[PDB]
Design a protein around this ligand. Structure first.
Ligand SMILES: [Mg+2]
Ligand SMILES: [Mg+2]
Ligand SMILES: [Mg+2]
Ligand SMILES: [Mg+2]
Ligand SMILES: [Mg+2]
Ligand SMILES: [Mg+2]
Ligand SMILES: [Mg+2]
Ligand SMILES: [Mg+2]
Ligand SMILES: [Mg+2]
Ligand SMILES: [Mg+2]
Ligand SMILES: [Mg+2]
Ligand SMILES: [Mg+2]
Ligand SMILES: [Mg+2]
Ligand SMILES: [Mg+2]
Ligand SMILES: [Mg+2]
Ligand SMILES: [Mg+2]
Ligand SMILES: [Mg+2]
Ligand SMILES: [Mg+2]
Ligand SMILES: [Mg+2]
Ligand SMILES: [Mg+2]
Ligand SMILES: [Mg+2]
Ligand SMILES: [Mg+2]
Ligand SMILES: [Mg+2]
Ligand SMILES: [Mg+2]
Ligand SMILES: [Mg+2]
Ligand SMILES: [Zn+2]
Lengths: 144, 129, 25, 102, 110
RNA sequence: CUCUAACUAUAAAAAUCUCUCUUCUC
RNA sequence: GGUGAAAUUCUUGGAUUUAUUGAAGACUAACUACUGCGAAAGCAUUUGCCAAGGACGUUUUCAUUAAUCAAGAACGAAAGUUAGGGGAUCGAAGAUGAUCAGAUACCGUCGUAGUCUUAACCAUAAACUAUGCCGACUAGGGAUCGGGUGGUGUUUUUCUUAUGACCCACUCGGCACCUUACGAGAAAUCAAAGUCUUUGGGUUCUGGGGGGAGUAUGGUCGCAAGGCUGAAACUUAAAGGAAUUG
RNA sequence: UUCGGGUCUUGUAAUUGGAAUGAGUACAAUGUAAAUACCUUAACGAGGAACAACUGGAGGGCAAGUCUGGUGCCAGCAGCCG
């Protein structure tokens, strides 16, 4: 009646059919192939430190006209280079050139969020201190 | 090919009930069909059936009275442990107050309540309500 | 675009790449 | 989606038929999707029947006819006015257009 | 021309506007080549060739071509790229040419 | 409650288009 | 000649048409249909031979020998590739004559390869009923093809009958079709796409948003063309189906 | 009869009173191998009871503003639509 076999001794083909079909998913394929460890900028890592290389802003998409103020960071753990986004009104000036910055995920499962092209990472901490504490003047940059 | 004959019998019963008839002609007429319809007679979901000898598998003529609403085989006769009877009743029967999972135990083909009364369980045949 | 002509363009790219490989095989 | 349950072909159980050419545009089209019109007419029209009758030996000539089955394509059939677009509830009808004259 | 015009703002500033000068980073430049994606190349009057984005309020509001004087705002964090902010319609450009805020070696006349 | 007849038959050329889309509760 | 209209082209060495004929190669018109056969491609002049096959009839024979199928295999349209044969038509390339702003496109005239075949490859098609196969049941109406039953039936004519051909009724099998929802669907619609939340007759293959991409790589087949197997990185908020009003 | 006593209650006011109590300190003792710490408890310890609770959000999904000022497809926000 249905495509799958139904006999009491058909466990083998049911199991192997499910096992072969599981590769059609994206989460299962990523988890089993281990693509996150090999190809992603961080291997199964929620956060990662890095060094600021330069200080660039990127224009937004079509329906949204602006320039989001990002920063190019070379990761210290392995040496990869990724653009990351500093999230707030006046936080670009807070981060200076060639300082250690702790990047985090951008919240969209390693994909570009909203209208910002070619970015996948936030900025949470700079030079050991957090952006949010600087933005509300609760702490200040050590300037070392 | 005809693999599960009881499936054909119950499908014919379902089709001839949904259309509003009062009789069915089941062709192959094995032991299991006779016992299944006998249980249905015992519980009232069926009327007055009949075995027609052909010297070749015989046949059955079933009389209905509209009291039944659905038969159905569990085609893979799963080994049903006495603990799994309640799960099958929940998954198949529409309410706990009625319905019967007809299953074949070593003590014969019996409704699930009778099997639970004997404290014996075996393979599952089908369901009626 | 048509799948036919995209297929044909891929075949012509394979033309060039196969000739190049045959030259350097 | 299916515009025609018959697919327009009218084949239903052959897989392949032998194509025929259009009389106007010479389109190699299958013989069943090749809408056919049997033009049977007089070799001399009603405009010259009297003239021919008055000026012909063999009094009461049978005036033989001419027969030709025209195998149109479908683009020509739409354009050369042979066949017309129809309502989707009128596409059901396959009878010829109701006996042009009785 | 077209029926587009009636959908527009009808902002009719035909009379002679007062030209805007350069302020602490905003500088004059000349369109050298037209690129795609709504971006232009501007030779600034400092010996540099900056890449200037066709910018908001300017994208599909004024139409600009090769060899047009322009006012463009820089970005202190990235000097190479910049944003076109205002366009001068070839009349006040002559005035700036006489006043010479830009080197006069860039002679662009019809 | 009784029937099977009439018929035709034109194809010149015609590419392109920019903003900007905005709440429905007794 | 030909065309919307022209021109290229052939022609008083008499073309275009006109009568007999002859040569070559291809094709099998009209009959030709909601008709037939086949596993699918596909199959249409006559006759003979060769073997094969479905359907029906059967108070014949064996008694589960069966259904679907990874591995393996046979055929597999057109196009294309090696050689040998032919070489009519039509016609990729090409040659031009037109149309245009351009036209090495569509209209036209020539025109190789090919089309047609004997061997050897190729294994892909919108190879479509975009509906896997086997099995059961469920609803009314006619027709149609093959077979078989009965008619106190009708013309047939060989005096009567036997056939055959019809007419009426029934049945089996097949390509199909009309109506309808009382069932199913997102609907278009389907008599199966029904008997599925009242979810299980057996069984094989395939899909998990779009693009990248049926791409690269690695195998494997192929002389070659290419076939089979076949991702990811990355990017994207949609792409898509049916139908309603403009 | 307009009332209106508020006849019977429930909130809002930088008005205003009397209480209770720890979070902290700390005689002790208990605790512990010895000490912290906890349980108990002297003596202190609340008026703005400054002994002061933040973290996010207020278009929709999704509870809560179409209030005020600022910026004007900038700055920025926005997991998605925006
Ligand atoms: Mg910009
Ligand atoms: Mg369409
Ligand atoms: Mg048709
Ligand atoms: Mg067939
Ligand atoms: Mg106006
Ligand atoms: Mg002659
Ligand atoms: Mg013939
Ligand atoms: Mg036939
Ligand atoms: Mg296989
Ligand atoms: Mg060939
Ligand atoms: Mg040859
Ligand atoms: Mg050409
Ligand atoms: Mg030309
Ligand atoms: Mg041509
Ligand atoms: Mg020719
Ligand atoms: Mg294919
Ligand atoms: Mg297919
Ligand atoms: Mg996908
Ligand atoms: Mg694809
Ligand atoms: Mg390869
Ligand atoms: Mg659509
Ligand atoms: Mg707050
Ligand atoms: Mg906020
Ligand atoms: Mg706010
Ligand atoms: Mg709300
Ligand atoms: Zn045509």
């Amino acid at each position: 009646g249905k495509g799958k076999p139904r006999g009491l001794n058909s466990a083998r083909k049911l199991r192997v059919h499910r096992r072969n079909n599981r590769w059609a998913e994206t989460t299962y394929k990523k988890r089993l192939l281990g693509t996150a460890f090999k190809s992603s900028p961080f291997g199964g890592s929620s956060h990662a430190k890095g060094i600021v290389l330069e200080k660039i802003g990127i224009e937004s998409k079509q329906p949204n006209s602006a320039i989001r103020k990002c920063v190019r960071v070379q990761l210290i753990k392995n040496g990869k280079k990724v653009t990351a986004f500093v999230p707030n009104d006046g936080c670009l000036n807070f981060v200076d050139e060639n300082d250690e910055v702790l990047l985090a995920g951008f919240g969209r499962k390693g994909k570009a969020k909203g209208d910002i092209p070619g970015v996948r990472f936030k900025v949470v901490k700079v030079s050991g201190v957090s952006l949010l504490a600087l933005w509300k003047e609760k702490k200040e940059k050590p300037r070392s | 090919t005809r693999t599960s004959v009881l499936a054909d019998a119950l499908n014919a019963i379902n089709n001839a009930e949904k259309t509003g008839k009062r009789q069915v002609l089941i062709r192959p007429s094995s032991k299991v069909i006779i016992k299944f319809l006998q249980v249905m007679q015992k519980h009232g979901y069926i009327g007055e059936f009949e075995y027609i000898d052909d010297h070749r598998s015989g046949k059955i003529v079933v009389q209905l009275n509209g009291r039944l609403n659905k038969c159905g085989v569990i085609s893979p006769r799963f080994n049903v442990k006495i603990a799994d009877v309640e799960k099958w009743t929940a998954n198949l029967l529409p309410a706990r107050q009625f319905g019967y999972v007809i299953l074949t135990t070593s003590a014969g083909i019996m409704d699930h309540e009778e099997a639970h009364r004997k404290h014996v369980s075996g393979k599952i045949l089908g369901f009626v309500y | 675009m048509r799948a036919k002509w995209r297929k044909k363009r891929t075949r012509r790219l394979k033309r060039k790449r196969r000739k190049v490989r045959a030259r350097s095989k | 989606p299916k515009k025609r349950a018959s697919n327009g072909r009218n084949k239903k159980g052959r897989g392949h038929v032998k194509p025929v050419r259009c009389v106007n545009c010479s389109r190699s089209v299958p013989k069943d999707k090749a809408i056919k019109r049997m033009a049977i007419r007089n070799i001399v029209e009603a405009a010259a029947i009297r003239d021919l009758s008055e000026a012909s030996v063999y009094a009461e000539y049978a005036l033989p006819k001419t027969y030709n089955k025209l195998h149109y394509c479908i683009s020509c059939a739409i354009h050369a006015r042979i066949v017309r677009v129809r309502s989707r509830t009128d596409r059901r009808i396959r009878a010829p257009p109701q006996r042009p004259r009785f | 021309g077209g029926k587009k015009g009636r959908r527009g703002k009808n902002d009719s500033d035909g009379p002679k506007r007062e030209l805007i000068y350069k302020e602490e980073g905003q500088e004059y430049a000349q369109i050298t080549k037209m690129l795609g994606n709504g971006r232009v190349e501007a030779s600034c009057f400092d010996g540099n060739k900056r890449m200037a984005h066709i910018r908001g309020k300017l994208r599909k509001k004024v139409w600009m071509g090769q060899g047009d004087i322009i006012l463009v705002s820089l970005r202190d964090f990235q000097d190479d790229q910049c944003d076109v902010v205002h366009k001068y319609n070839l009349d006040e450009a002559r005035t700036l040419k006489n006043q010479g805020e830009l080197p006069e070696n860039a002679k662009i006349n019809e």
